[PDB]
């Protein structure tokens, strides 16, 4: 039997004593293909069971495996639901789900009627789908369906956050068939390509060690190139078996299954063989130690893809993949030192993803705050703010709640951009166009062509499947789709992705101000205006267009704004009053700013300041000293909210701090003479100004009644420079900032420059300055 059966009784005995159960067992213990069936044939659990598989290279496979384990040809008792299709029949009471189908299923049936068990598989991968699902399930176990059992399966012995959140939940832990694997480290050379060096390393291992080999790579292109390279350096008894995506599920089993006797096999797998899939016959592992992770960018609204070194947890998963059958060997293609510097664990997907779909789903569920849910990691605040802004651009929000259009979008259970494109259609023709566009953007094609019109025409059975599904969710029973309708719809959802060329050789510039690249001979480089919904970025460098359509700005919808600006550029010594018709940082039209109102060209002068610098304004001595004093206050009187006065802050806040004081300027010359002291001072409410005048004063009152201005500085301490006939009161040394910073006294400037000091207790060390020209006349408390 399988190593997990050893805990089958205990598991059962815990599945009935608690609403939640956590089971941890290493990879290879039949958690996905043995445990579900044994829980089916158990009277303790009532109803049907759903098993969440986040990957879906494992989901289809685990449905097929669990069906084969009963001779059942999945559909009879074991079924599955994918995003586009599914397989269920009256007698199936166990269903494998994936692609966020469970989150939608809970949205549509929040009592999960008919289900007594939900199994969250592969939870250590920390997918965002599973996090959301768990929050929803825990919320369902609050209302009715108290009886609903939650089994959370992880594959790592330690689950810190999970116990920390469900500390009243039974932890079942399996052990077993683990052999030691010698860990070897081989850094790759820099004069060799990646595919070439990995192939050389793998071929060397095959020639130096026995058995079959598992090789982890960052993606399918790496897999294909490394395989082509291996072809030459490998003997005749070696079978190269890719593993990715789907190729027939036959050669997939060709790589999972052992190698026919008299043959060794090299399996070329993505991280899907890290814990999701169990490769057989392996005792040699080659880990490239590089992987592709997603990082959302609130600035650009793009999820860029970054190739980074893998964590330690994953390196250990991979090394252990070679010890299931006998003593093995893992070879990591980095240097031991870099491996020890590696990140301890992987980052939860929820801390680095786009949460627009997540925000929308939590809103439909009736949430006030996205963070008021049962989370392992709390959704980052910046990304929640970006999700909210995106949902506002798309009209999905009405205040903090969902609006009507937003509720329709939330209905379709889609990526919010695509959902908004689906909802914005009026006709049935527009709706079908949007359906096919959505099918293509969810599952882009890997053709050497980058136009969206050819994809829109190019046939595909799965795109048609998903468009039919979306059209039945939309309830449009007859429509016709042509390409002339692609561009208007896109404009409502991918508006921040419109793009204008930069010369020929069509490196472009996007509306969010990052620019993109096509390849120098794509058909589309001949076009002024593109709109690119699919972009690839990562590793501030570009920006390569993956899928995009042609566009003609004439007659387009009404998403363009006006930016006026008035500058006085010196080179040719003339003024400048432009009005740009822009759509988001891309200048469409430039026209003269003729006959402008006074509100505009107040704003236009503000834009001019923003583009030429605050040096433009009339920085008088009092004003410079005020800016210095505010810097100093922020660093010395922290407990009060001192408005930051760096250049960027003031340039961004011009609207709120300089505009109010401008009514009555009417010209650029009159603005350039405006004293800004009062506007900076206005940056403070009454009482903050009083605070800054008493604490951090403009001038110190020495013990003779002679007010003497202080010199503030960004870096240096404040300095007095008093004539020192008058520094005889000796209070204890003058101090400012509620007694925390003592003035640096320039005791001299009588003639100047004889001692600078900050202690006022060199009286008992001055002991020189009793010699002054006539005499001192200073000693011992004169005044
Ligand atoms: N398609 C398959 N072909 C052969 N063996 C399989 C298959 N699926 C599962 N197994 C067997 O099940 C075990 C690993 O699967 P499983 O216990 O589901 O791993 P996990 O613990 O990651 O769920 C192995 O011992 C293997 O013998
Ligand atoms: F079902 Al598993 F690792 F938990 F493959």
From Swiss-Prot:
The keyword ATP-binding applies. It catalyses: ATP + H2O = ADP + phosphate + H(+). It comes from Escherichia coli (strain K12). Pfam families: CON_HrpB, DEAD, Helicase_C, HrpB_C. ATP binds at residues 25-32. Coiled coil: none annotated. The gene is hrpB. This is ATP-dependent RNA helicase HrpB. Residues 12-175 form the Helicase ATP-binding domain. A motif (DEFH box) lies at residues 121-124. GO terms for molecular function: ATP binding; ATP hydrolysis activity; ribonucleoside triphosphate phosphatase activity; RNA helicase activity; single-stranded RNA binding. Belongs to the DEAD box helicase family. Its EC number is 3.6.4.13. It comes from the Bacteria. SMART domains: DEXDc, HA2, HELICc. Residues 193-366 form the Helicase C-terminal domain. Keywords: ATP-binding, Helicase, Hydrolase, Nucleotide-binding.
């Amino acid at each position: 039997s399988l190593p997990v059966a050893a805990v089958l009784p205990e598991l059962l005995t815990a599945l009935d004593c608690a609403p939640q159960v956590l089971l941890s067992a290493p990879t290879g213990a039949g958690k996905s293909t043995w445990l579900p069936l044994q829980l089916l044939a158990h009277p303790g659990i009532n109803g049907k069971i759903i098993l969440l598989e986040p990957r879906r290279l494992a989901a289809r496979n685990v449905a097929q495996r669990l069906a084969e384990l009963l001779n059942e040809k999945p559909g009879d008792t074991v079924g599955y639901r994918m995003r586009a299709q599914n397989c269920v029949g009256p007698n199936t009471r166990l269903e494998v789900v994936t692609e966020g189908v469970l989150t939608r299923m809970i949205q549509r049936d929040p009592e999960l009627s008919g289900v007594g068990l939900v199994i969250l598989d592969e939870f250590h991968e920390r997918s965002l789908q599973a996090d959301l699902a768990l929050a929803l399930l825990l919320d369902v176990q609050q209302g009715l369906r108290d009886d609903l059992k939650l089994l959370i399966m992880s594959a790592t012995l330690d689950n810190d956050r999970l116990q920390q959140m469900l500390p009243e939940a039974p932890v079942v832990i399996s052990e077993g068939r683990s052999f030691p694997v010698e860990r070897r480290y081989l850094p790759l050379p820099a004069h060799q390509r990646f595919d070439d060096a990995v192939a050389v390393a793998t071929a060397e291992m095959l020639r130096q060690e026995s058995g079959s080999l598992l090789l982890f790579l960052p993606g399918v292109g790496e897999i294909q190139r490394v395989q082509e390279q291996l072809a030459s350096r490998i003997g005749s008894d070696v079978l190269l078996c890719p593993l990715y995506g789907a190729l027939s599920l036959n050669d997939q089993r060709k790589a999972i299954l052992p190698a026919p006797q008299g043959m060794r096999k090299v399996v070329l797998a993505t991280n899907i063989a890290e814990t999701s899939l169990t490769i057989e016959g392996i005792r040699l592992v080659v880990d490239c130690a590089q992987e592709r992770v997603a990082r959302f960018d609130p600035r650009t609204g793009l999820t860029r893809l970054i190739t980074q070194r893998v964590s330690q947890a994953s390196m250990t998963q991979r090394a252990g993949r070679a010890g299931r059958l006998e003593p093995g060997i893992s070879l990591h293609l980095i240097a031991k030192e870099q491996a020890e510097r590696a990140a301890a664990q992987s980052e939860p997907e929820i801390l680095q993803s786009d949460l627009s779909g997540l925000l929308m789903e939590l809103l439909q569920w009736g949430c006030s705050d996205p963070a008021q849910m049962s989370w392992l990691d709390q959704p980052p605040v910046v990304n929640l703010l970006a999700a909210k802004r995106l949902l506002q651009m798309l009209g999905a929000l009405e205040g903090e709640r969902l609006s009507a259009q937003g509720q329709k979008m939330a209905a379709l259970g889609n990526d919010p951009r695509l959902a908004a494109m689906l909802v914005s259609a009026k006709n049935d023709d527009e709706a079908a166009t949007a359906a096919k566009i959505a099918a293509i953007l969810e599952e882009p094609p890997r053709m050497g062509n980058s136009d969206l019109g050819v994809a829109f025409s190019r046939n595909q059975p799965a795109w048609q499947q998903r468009s039919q599904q979306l059209l039945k969710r939309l309830n449009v029973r007859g429509g016709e789709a042509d390409s002339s309708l692609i561009a208007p719809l896109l404009a409502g959802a991918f508006a921040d992705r419109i793009a204008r060329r930069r010369g020929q050789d069509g490196r472009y510039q996007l509306a969010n101000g990052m620019g993109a690249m096509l390849d120098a001979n794509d058909a589309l480089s001949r076009h002024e205006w593109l709109i690119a919904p699919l972009l690839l970025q990562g590793s501030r460098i570009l920006l390569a267009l993956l899928v995009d359509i042609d566009e003609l700005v004439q007659r387009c919808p009404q998403l363009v704004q006006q930016s006026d600006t008035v500058e006085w550029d010196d080179a040719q010594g003339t003024l400048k009053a432009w009005r740009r018709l822009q759509i988001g940082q891309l200048t469409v039209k430039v026209q003269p700013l003729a006959k402008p109102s006074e509100d505009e060209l107040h704003q236009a002068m503000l834009n001019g300041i923003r583009d030429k610098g605050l040096s433009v304004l009339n920085w008088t001595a009092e004003a410079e000293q005020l800016r210095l004093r505010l810097l100093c206050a922020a660093k010395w009187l922290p407990e009060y909210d001192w408005p930051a006065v760096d250049d960027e802050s003031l340039l961004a806040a011009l609207e709120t701090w300089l505009l109010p004081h401008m009514t009555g300027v009417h010209s650029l010359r009159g603005l350039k003479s405006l004293d800004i002291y009062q506007a900076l001072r206005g940056l403070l409410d009454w009482g903050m100004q009083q605070r800054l005048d008493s604490e951090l004063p403009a001038h110190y009152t020495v013990p003779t009644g002679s007010r003497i201005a202080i010199r503030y500085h960004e870096d240096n301490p404040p300095a007095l420079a008093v004539r020192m006939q008058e520094m005889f009161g000796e209070a204890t040394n003058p101090t400012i900032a509620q007694g925390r910073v003592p003035l640096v006294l320039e005791l001299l400037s009588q003639r100047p420059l004889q001692i600078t000091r900050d202690l006022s207790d060199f009286w008992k060390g001055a002991y020189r300055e009793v010699q002054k020209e006539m005499k001192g006349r200073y000693p011992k408390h004169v005044w």
